[PDB]
Amino acid sequence: SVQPGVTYSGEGTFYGATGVGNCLYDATSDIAIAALNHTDYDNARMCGAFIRVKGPRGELTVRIVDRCPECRPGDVDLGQQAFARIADPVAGRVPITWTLVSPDLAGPVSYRYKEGSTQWWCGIQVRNHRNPVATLEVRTGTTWRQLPRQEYNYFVSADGAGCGSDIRVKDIHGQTLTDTGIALTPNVDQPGRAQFTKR
Amino acid sequence: ASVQPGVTYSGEGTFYGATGVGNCLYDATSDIAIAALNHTDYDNARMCGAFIRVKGPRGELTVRIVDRCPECRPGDVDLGQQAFARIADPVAGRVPITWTLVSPDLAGPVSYRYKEGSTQWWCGIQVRNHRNPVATLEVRTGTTWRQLPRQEYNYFVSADGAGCGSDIRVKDIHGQTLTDTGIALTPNVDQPGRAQFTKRA
Amino acid sequence: ASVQPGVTYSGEGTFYGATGVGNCLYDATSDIAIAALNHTDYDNARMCGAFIRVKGPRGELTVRIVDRCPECRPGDVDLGQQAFARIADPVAGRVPITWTLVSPDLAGPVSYRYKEGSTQWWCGIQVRNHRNPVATLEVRTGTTWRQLPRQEYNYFVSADGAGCGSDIRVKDIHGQTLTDTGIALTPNVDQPGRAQFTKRA
Amino acid sequence: SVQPGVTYSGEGTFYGATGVGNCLYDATSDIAIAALNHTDYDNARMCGAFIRVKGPRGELTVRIVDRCPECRPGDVDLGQQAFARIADPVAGRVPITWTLVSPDLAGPVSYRYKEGSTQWWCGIQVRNHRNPVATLEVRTGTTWRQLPRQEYNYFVSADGAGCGSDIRVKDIHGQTLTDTGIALTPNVDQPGRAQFTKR
């Protein structure tokens, strides 16, 4: 699995990325985006990860927004303009190396309840996270309940437990941020009060 | 993450020739109160070592999960032969059951076991004697911590050796973390930690 | 193998900006009647290229499956935006639908496409223009045949190159086999076979 | 995936095999049985496969009856007495090489309906097959329906379609055997009329 501090080798390709994809983020005007190969995508664990990709002609930090099912471990399918920053587009497929980075990013994490969320059933997506998210939990009285991440990058409470309650997220470095006062309001990005530490 | 505390599940109970060995990679035991859990609820070993109180037509018994039943449906439990006779007529073969996760009295702290062949270059760690089911295990890497993915065979594995032999911390399904140090990198020896998870009412 | 001929399914229809590219690895198309199928029913690309007749409040439309929708539930279809408007009011966004597999009129035989980079050491073959969903693909190895496993990206792959460039035979979900020869080991070119699967009433 | 005509390398271990296991076969007095590592087991595709295993002290053909989740690709967890034919039990873990074989085996294939099979739901297991089975289908009028194999080595018709009808099985070599007159009778092994070719 993808780990910080490790340089991976693979192949870079490109596609018509818009920001929509398997991570269920919104379309973006930012070109520095990519789909990650299925293996490394890891059931959305790498959604929103920033990776710095080196190609024959340059390097660029991109955000993972999508999954590439036919790409092999180590492979990255960059957006068309992102690819042109690191390689000649005529080459089509080029050697790359890349690493997971913890970049500058302003503001706190935010939370988005999935369409149709209520106290009976809900899903939560984390947005604006500096480092990849490992887990999400919701408070159930005196204890907390982990919500399983789905490949489409929402953490789901299938029976509604904890929906509308306190939320806490833990990144891949082991840091936990706890958030109160997130309303049970589908389709709105709600800021928390903290960001993960820049590593 | 189907199985949740505070929920009563319905299903069918069957039995098999359980010895204590199985998909959770625990040891043979003389204890009767053991069972295999259906694949769905087993949940990639998240329910390994869980204690569930099972009610059948002839009684109730708290059993620990030591194995996985691939053909059993959600809600189903394949009990050890002697455990089944405590809650049902063995001649029946298959009976209606209800069950729930429990947080029982348990003596001693959690323990850790390094997998055969573990070194600083590759390792796996199994948790033993945990009062509540374990959700996650991490090892310390300098100033940060690294999650080790649990395999279906109930070891949390560090494929590149990072954190092997370092501090360990485990988080149960209720959200409580226990941190342990001084666990030596010694394969196939159970080593006690400092504490047990809280008993949940 | 959830989706079966002769069965009608209920679910929810939504829409997305479909261009024809997607998880089935087909080419961009100007055709209206395309859709993504929910992950469960997509079934590891078994439903790639399936034709389903979808009914919504405004009427019915036969669409071909070109993509997979991971967040959609069993029974759900994520139609192309223009296709959706044939069966429902786009302002509604999400509508009840019913649908079933169809065996439509289709011109010409099946065709085969070797994946980029296919050689004697590794190859993948995609089937195109098939009237009914494909179940299996095999390549001839001397006196026997070898199944190539379908990947979720809708190529049947020979991981070690065995049978690459050999005779090919495909079996549809109705159990009919078509055997084809003379398909060259030439990546990125659609090569026609000699026959189409039977039209099923 | 496991193919004929290839020599695989791995490690041999042993366990208390009785014949019961992930393939849902019955207990047997034959000691020449083994569990195959999860990857090569391949969702029961290798259930009932015969593999010839060479260890440091001997060679033995065993039948796959079970799955070993912690074993790596190429690894075989033999029954205790089978292991003792190819290695000293005190060694515990030994290098092995093995191949998929098409051995002598008498009688035709047989079929077993799973407990609880009816016109509304059924499962079918194939027994006494010389070569591994790839697919099983049941006849639905003028067409045939593939039944998906489960990891527990029954092919299941979730809605009962084809249950009690004609059955046909195709082995990994591409040979199809068709059988009529198999009754919808749970828990009995019913012989077909043919065996797969000895390759």
Tab-separated table of N, CA, C and O in Angstrom, chain A residues 54-90:
chain	number	residue	atom	x	y	z
A	54	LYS	N	7.077	12.897	-11.192
A	54	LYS	CA	8.201	13.295	-12.025
A	54	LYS	C	8.135	12.525	-13.334
A	54	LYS	O	8.037	11.293	-13.329
A	55	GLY	N	8.155	13.252	-14.444
A	55	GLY	CA	8.194	12.657	-15.756
A	55	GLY	C	9.427	13.105	-16.510
A	55	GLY	O	10.298	13.790	-15.963
A	56	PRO	N	9.522	12.729	-17.787
A	56	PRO	CA	10.723	13.079	-18.563
A	56	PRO	C	10.964	14.572	-18.707
A	56	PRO	O	12.120	14.987	-18.872
A	57	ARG	N	9.919	15.399	-18.656
A	57	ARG	CA	10.055	16.820	-18.945
A	57	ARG	C	9.816	17.733	-17.750
A	57	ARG	O	9.986	18.948	-17.883
A	58	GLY	N	9.424	17.201	-16.598
A	58	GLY	CA	9.221	18.041	-15.437
A	58	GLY	C	8.499	17.280	-14.343
A	58	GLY	O	8.294	16.069	-14.437
A	59	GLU	N	8.126	18.015	-13.296
A	59	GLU	CA	7.405	17.434	-12.173
A	59	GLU	C	6.227	18.317	-11.777
A	59	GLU	O	6.221	19.527	-12.009
A	60	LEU	N	5.214	17.687	-11.195
A	60	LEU	CA	3.986	18.380	-10.840
A	60	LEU	C	3.345	17.624	-9.689
A	60	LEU	O	3.291	16.392	-9.704
A	61	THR	N	2.869	18.363	-8.694
A	61	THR	CA	2.055	17.767	-7.645
A	61	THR	C	0.605	17.767	-8.097
A	61	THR	O	0.080	18.803	-8.511
A	62	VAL	N	-0.028	16.600	-8.035
A	62	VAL	CA	-1.411	16.432	-8.455
A	62	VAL	C	-2.214	15.843	-7.301
A	62	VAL	O	-1.675	15.197	-6.396
A	63	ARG	N	-3.522	16.080	-7.339
A	63	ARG	CA	-4.450	15.513	-6.371
A	63	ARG	C	-5.183	14.333	-7.006
A	63	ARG	O	-5.645	14.428	-8.148
A	64	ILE	N	-5.292	13.226	-6.269
A	64	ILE	CA	-6.024	12.051	-6.744
A	64	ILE	C	-7.526	12.296	-6.633
A	64	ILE	O	-8.047	12.574	-5.545
A	65	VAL	N	-8.232	12.170	-7.760
A	65	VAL	CA	-9.671	12.385	-7.806
A	65	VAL	C	-10.421	11.210	-8.411
A	65	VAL	O	-11.648	11.253	-8.506
A	66	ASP	N	-9.732	10.155	-8.815
A	66	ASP	CA	-10.364	9.135	-9.632
A	66	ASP	C	-9.515	7.876	-9.538
A	66	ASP	O	-8.417	7.883	-8.971
A	67	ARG	N	-10.047	6.793	-10.104
A	67	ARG	CA	-9.443	5.468	-10.095
A	67	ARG	C	-9.299	4.993	-11.537
A	67	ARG	O	-10.202	5.196	-12.352
A	68	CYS	N	-8.162	4.376	-11.855
A	68	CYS	CA	-7.928	3.804	-13.181
A	68	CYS	C	-7.905	2.287	-13.055
A	68	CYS	O	-6.946	1.730	-12.493
A	69	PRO	N	-8.933	1.577	-13.527
A	69	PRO	CA	-8.975	0.126	-13.303
A	69	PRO	C	-7.938	-0.654	-14.090
A	69	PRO	O	-7.503	-1.715	-13.625
A	70	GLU	N	-7.536	-0.182	-15.268
A	70	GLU	CA	-6.607	-0.955	-16.083
A	70	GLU	C	-5.145	-0.630	-15.804
A	70	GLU	O	-4.259	-1.346	-16.284
A	71	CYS	N	-4.872	0.410	-15.029
A	71	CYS	CA	-3.508	0.781	-14.692
A	71	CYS	C	-2.949	-0.170	-13.633
A	71	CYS	O	-3.678	-0.670	-12.773
A	72	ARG	N	-1.644	-0.427	-13.710
A	72	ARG	CA	-0.954	-1.343	-12.806
A	72	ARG	C	-0.474	-0.608	-11.565
A	72	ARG	O	-0.441	0.624	-11.534
A	73	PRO	N	-0.072	-1.334	-10.517
A	73	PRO	CA	0.530	-0.669	-9.353
A	73	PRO	C	1.672	0.244	-9.771
A	73	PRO	O	2.513	-0.123	-10.593
A	74	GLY	N	1.685	1.457	-9.212
A	74	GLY	CA	2.662	2.461	-9.573
A	74	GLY	C	2.244	3.381	-10.696
A	74	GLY	O	2.901	4.408	-10.912
A	75	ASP	N	1.170	3.061	-11.411
A	75	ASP	CA	0.764	3.847	-12.567
A	75	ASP	C	-0.172	4.981	-12.162
A	75	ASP	O	-0.969	4.856	-11.231
A	76	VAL	N	-0.081	6.088	-12.897
A	76	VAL	CA	-0.913	7.266	-12.685
A	76	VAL	C	-1.452	7.707	-14.039
A	76	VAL	O	-0.684	7.848	-14.997
A	77	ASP	N	-2.763	7.936	-14.115
A	77	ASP	CA	-3.437	8.425	-15.320
A	77	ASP	C	-3.752	9.899	-15.062
A	77	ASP	O	-4.754	10.227	-14.421
A	78	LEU	N	-2.881	10.786	-15.538
A	78	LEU	CA	-3.002	12.202	-15.231
A	78	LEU	C	-4.044	12.863	-16.127
A	78	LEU	O	-4.380	12.367	-17.204
A	79	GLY	N	-4.568	13.998	-15.669
A	79	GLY	CA	-5.316	14.853	-16.568
A	79	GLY	C	-4.463	15.295	-17.742
A	79	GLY	O	-3.238	15.305	-17.676
A	80	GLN	N	-5.127	15.664	-18.839
A	80	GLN	CA	-4.402	15.954	-20.073
A	80	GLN	C	-3.399	17.087	-19.884
A	80	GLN	O	-2.233	16.970	-20.281
A	81	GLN	N	-3.832	18.196	-19.277
A	81	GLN	CA	-2.926	19.326	-19.091
A	81	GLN	C	-1.857	19.019	-18.046
A	81	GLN	O	-0.710	19.464	-18.175
A	82	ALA	N	-2.212	18.269	-16.999
A	82	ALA	CA	-1.207	17.860	-16.022
A	82	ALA	C	-0.107	17.036	-16.678
A	82	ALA	O	1.079	17.249	-16.412
A	83	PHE	N	-0.486	16.091	-17.547
A	83	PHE	CA	0.500	15.262	-18.238
A	83	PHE	C	1.467	16.118	-19.047
A	83	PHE	O	2.682	15.873	-19.043
A	84	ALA	N	0.948	17.135	-19.737
A	84	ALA	CA	1.794	17.993	-20.553
A	84	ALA	C	2.831	18.748	-19.730
A	84	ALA	O	3.835	19.203	-20.289
A	85	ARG	N	2.622	18.886	-18.418
A	85	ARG	CA	3.627	19.517	-17.571
A	85	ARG	C	4.819	18.614	-17.295
A	85	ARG	O	5.901	19.121	-16.981
A	86	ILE	N	4.650	17.296	-17.382
A	86	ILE	CA	5.714	16.363	-17.022
A	86	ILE	C	6.229	15.548	-18.196
A	86	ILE	O	7.224	14.827	-18.035
A	87	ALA	N	5.601	15.628	-19.366
A	87	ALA	CA	5.966	14.739	-20.458
A	87	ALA	C	5.446	15.317	-21.761
A	87	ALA	O	4.573	16.189	-21.772
A	88	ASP	N	5.998	14.818	-22.862
A	88	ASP	CA	5.503	15.168	-24.186
A	88	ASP	C	4.219	14.391	-24.445
A	88	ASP	O	4.241	13.153	-24.422
A	89	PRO	N	3.090	15.060	-24.688
A	89	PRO	CA	1.834	14.319	-24.892
A	89	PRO	C	1.882	13.350	-26.055
A	89	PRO	O	1.176	12.332	-26.029
A	90	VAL	N	2.700	13.633	-27.072
A	90	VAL	CA	2.816	12.733	-28.214
A	90	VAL	C	3.346	11.370	-27.788
A	90	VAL	O	3.040	10.352	-28.420
